[PDB]
Design a protein around this ligand. Structure first.
Ligand SMILES: Nc1ncnc2c1ncn2[C@@H]1O[C@H](CSCC[C@H](N)C(=O)O)[C@@H](O)[C@H]1O
Ligand SMILES: Nc1ncnc2c1ncn2[C@@H]1O[C@H](CSCC[C@H](N)C(=O)O)[C@@H](O)[C@H]1O
Ligand SMILES: [Cl-]
Ligand SMILES: [Cl-]
Lengths: 449, 450
């Protein structure tokens, strides 16, 4: 082992940074977050240091390095651009047995600053001893995506339930299984973060009361339009914790590859399935005590029938939550170079589905961006009706097929060509009508296929 | 943060353990592996301390605590079962400004020892500060199952190449590019694990020979409406690797906590072409620039304007969509934007227009839609009067969602004839939702009522 990681308590302890530029500022922000009683000594200071000083958050000492500034110090950081100054700092700290980091020279000093993932009280630190700072960064990024934002509040609450857990679960078998359900419960972590103190006491009692086996709940998760990079952090966290994942055709294979190895999968796409059967599967699986994730393409509440699936659960007393996703309109817009709004082009964006019938005079009005979902089959009618109701024949149009995916295809033109531009694509595809479509020739950045 | 993690270099540095039982034995093994010059001071010692002392690996001082043994020390560990003695050690260490761990009292004294995942030279340390040892152990086990066992060989080889990388690549941008390729090459990792030096050298020589794009870039990133969990995975990647992040007031503090600590931050919460110049400015200097925008970049965010300069200015760019306020406020208020036959259209509408343009109220008042007004608080009374005048039913439900998706989220709701009054109960940022779907909140609301 090259270095020993320790987690220092710095609250109100004297620490010293030498240097007053951007590098020193980053280290100072870190030590302030840890509560250090901070002095910064430098020949000159960038303005953020005087802001902090005037706010009484640290002390500044302007001038050359004064090794007596270390006399009461617990940690030192040499953060200047001057190798000679940094070695003077490093030597003075060493003679005083003060752990010291030289920012530009990790093996020149007595401690290295790792990458940090802060979920205080829970903390994770990554370092390769200076051999691989980019790898430490790549691991830090992975860990930030995996650890829920409010995990620390759960951790603090856990330590307060320590003794109570021991007495109702004598066997360490059952006991750890409880903690496994506890650090995973969404209503608890939410009630804590939102300071909803009666839900915390409620969910606490429900966690103890219901059988240890049971963790029945349904999370509706928006998978986004296809690119697995467009899943939300929380959506990834939820699919990693699921006992069973219920999904359909519009959830991309790339998203499904992120689903936990041990999760049961239930495919409800597809000859066709009624929504009521899907509703009952969610009900049936949650009633067995499973943590259920219902993965839906795009956003669950935009033409996804997410509401219908949750009203079945509200009847049965099954807890649920919703993780929004990137709807097809947002994803296709970003990846085709067609902003849904721009300057004065559109006062409104309309997301419309292709029962009555569409209000064609309403759809034809000026200063809109129209986005048709499930409209390929009525495309020929859309062209004829918009033309008949006064939309200018030179209005730009675009179709985006498999938006955000590696096989995305975008075709475009004006409105008088829409009907047979639509033959050149298949589902899933969006139709975008409006002046913003012309911006594609300037803003297109994604590969076209 | 509760603690500051640091990785200490203990080679040939004096450390002191007080105590000589099983706890002290565990901690002594750690400090010996780190190369410490170790003294152990205890009334009695378990047999392993004899094995170590006979091999010359540490010094035993058999007897009560001698605080002068701290005089040359860099770290102290109090590992007895006597709380009076442990406190004497911690008091003596504190007077000398020596970081001290009291093993059975994490809240006392000045450092705690984390759980370690070892991929030397790569190491990952985990701790909950003694608050939840079970969570630390659970988290430690998943990190083990995520870090390949050969990652240490990859990091070892990187350290051996660092001097060559600094010599051959003039700029930090080029060196970073090299490492980003180096650390994801699966064949190189396999060749290192197999000690196949022929294959290692072949891949390495090709990596050194590749052109590296000196281009700075601009990425527009949708931060989402506030909950940091609603950042996209790709959006997190961008802000964790950015050189400079340009952000504004509608990006939440929690999202800014995910920006790389070494990134510079530029706040622009300021006219629009002022922002445009900053982006082009910083990208022309070869930096990875992220424009981090509330919600989605291309929905009432002026993202189009921010990009239209860079096309002929020769600067590459890309766009990462985000959760727009309508989608986030919908999910977190229990108000789906569509449902059954309630809405044929969702309309995202701006509430503030050009100094001469006005909304098409006849168009907005039509049935079977969900209206969502962005930046419309100041016009709420006008929205009520106009929607009523163009035929919307007086009892149409409405809701205002303030700071949607954040822990401070507030929702007020009523009917259209109350919209003006309801809007005075909230402040920016808030969304106005108008439509029959608002009545689903009583059944679908899961997040809070504040
Ligand atoms: N990747 C994609 N590219 C283009 N259109 C897509 C798409 N994914 C879904 N769609 C559109 O969405 C329709 C299904 S309705 C489901 C919409 C989903 N809830 C969402 O928020 O996006 C398809 O017919 C198609 O018009
Ligand atoms: N968290 C939030 N809660 C409610 N409204 C929000 C919000 N964040 C942004 N908004 C709305 O968005 C307006 C700014 S316009 C920026 C919108 C952004 N591009 C997006 O896609 O959401 C605000 O005036 C407010 O109406
Ligand atoms: Cl490193
Ligand atoms: Cl802990």
């Amino acid at each position: 082992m090259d270095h020993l990681p320790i987690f220092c308590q710095l609250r109100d302890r004297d620490c010293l940074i030498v240097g007053g530029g951007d590098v020193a500022e980053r280290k100072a922000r870190l030590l302030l977050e840890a509560g250090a009683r901070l002095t910064v000594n430098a020949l000159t200071f960038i303005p953020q240091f005087t802001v902090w000083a005037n706010e009484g958050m640290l002390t500044l000492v302007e001038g050359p390095f004064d090794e007596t500034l270390l006399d009461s110090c617990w940690l030192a950081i040499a953060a200047t651009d001057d190798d000679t100054v940094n070695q003077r700092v490093s030597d003075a700290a060493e003679s005083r047995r003060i752990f010291c980091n030289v920012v530009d020279a990790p093996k020149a000093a007595s401690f290295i600053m790792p990458s940090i993932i802060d979920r205080s009280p829970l903390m994770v630190a990554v370092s390769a001893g200076g051999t691989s700072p980019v790898l430490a960064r790549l691991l830090r990024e992975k860990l930030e995506s995996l650890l829920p934002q409010h995990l620390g509040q759960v951790a603090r609450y856990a330590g307060q339930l320590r003794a109570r857990v021991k007495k109702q679960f004598a066997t360490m078998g059952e006991r750890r299984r409880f903690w496994e359900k506890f650090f995973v419960n969404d209503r608890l972590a939410q009630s804590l973060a939102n300071a909803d103190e009666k839900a915390v006491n409620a969910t606490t009692e429900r966690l103890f009361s219901e059988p240890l086996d049971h963790r029945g709940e349904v999370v509706l998760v928006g998978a986004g339009p296809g690119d697995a990079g467009l899943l939300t952090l929380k959506g990834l966290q939820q699919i990693q914790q699921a006992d069973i994942v219920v999904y359909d055709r519009l959830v991309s294979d790339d998203i499904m590859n992120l689903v936990a190895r041990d999760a049961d999968r239930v495919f409800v796409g597809k000859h066709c399935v009624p929504q009521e059967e899907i509703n009952q599967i969610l009900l049936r699986e949650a009633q067995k005590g499973k943590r259920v994730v219902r993965l839906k393409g795009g956003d669950p509440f935009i033409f996804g029938r997410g509401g219908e699936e949750l009203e079945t659960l509200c009847h049965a007393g099954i807890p649920f939550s919703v993780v929004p996703g990137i709807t097809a309109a947002s994803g296709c817009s970003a990846y085709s170079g067609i902003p849904l709004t721009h300057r004065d082009y559109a006062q409104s964006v309309r997301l419309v589905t292709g029962g009555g019938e569409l209000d064609w005079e309403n759809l034809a009005a000026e200063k809109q961006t129209l986005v048709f979902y499930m409209g390929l089959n009525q495309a020929a009618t859309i062209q004829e009706k918009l033309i008949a109701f006064g939309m200018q024949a030179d209005m730009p149009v675009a179709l985006v097929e498999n938006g955000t995916s590696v096989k995305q295809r975008v075709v475009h033109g004006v409105l008088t060509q829409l009907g047979e531009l639509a033959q050149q694509v298949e589902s899933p595809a969006l139709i975008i009508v409006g002046r913003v479509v012309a911006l594609r020739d300037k803003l297109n950045w994604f590969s076209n296929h």
